[PDB]
């Protein structure tokens, strides 16, 4: 689009059908934990 080839390193990671969605929780759910 701009200047170069875009791939994203295809075929590299094996993931589940639901794939590791979010999962990282970003840790913003710590608002209920103390």
């Amino acid at each position: 689009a701009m200047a170069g080839i875009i791939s994203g390193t295809p075929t590299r990671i094996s993931v589940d059908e639901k794939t590791e969605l979010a999962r990282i929780a970003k840790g913003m759910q710590d608002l209920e934990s103390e």
Binding site: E17, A22, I24, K26, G27, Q29, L31
Partner: protein, 107 residues
């Protein structure tokens, strides 16, 4: 907005967020249902309850597993899985929107 709300009431909200989020998803393809009502309910509580996106993000992951799980066992098309990706992204974007507008800017 009120004094520190009890922990259970918070869970009660979450209990609703889980079902509501779920409800939003079911109505995403509604024939006449105003998913907006489902989204508005979730969007409304999430902001008020100061619910971090994380739960929205994590809660989605669990439910998403529920659908793909049945798809594998029920031997059904998993193409519909996108609906959860669309619902998840659309939902987060919606509350992310009000968060943006809820921020007064000097003029």
């Amino acid at each position: 907005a009120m004094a520190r709300m009890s922990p259970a009431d918070k869970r009660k909200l979450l209990d609703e967020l889980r079902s509501i989020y779920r409800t939003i998803v079911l109505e995403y393809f509604n024939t006449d249902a105003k998913v907006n009502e489902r989204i508005d309910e979730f969007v409304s509580k999430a902001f008020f309850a100061d619910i971090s996106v994380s739960q929205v993000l994590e809660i989605h992951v669990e439910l998403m597993d529920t659908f793909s799980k049945q798809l594998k066992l029920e031997g059904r098309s998993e193409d519909i899985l996108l609906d959860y990706r669309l619902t998840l992204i659309d939902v987060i974007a919606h509350l992310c929107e009000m968060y943006r507008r809820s921020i007064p800017r000097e003029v």
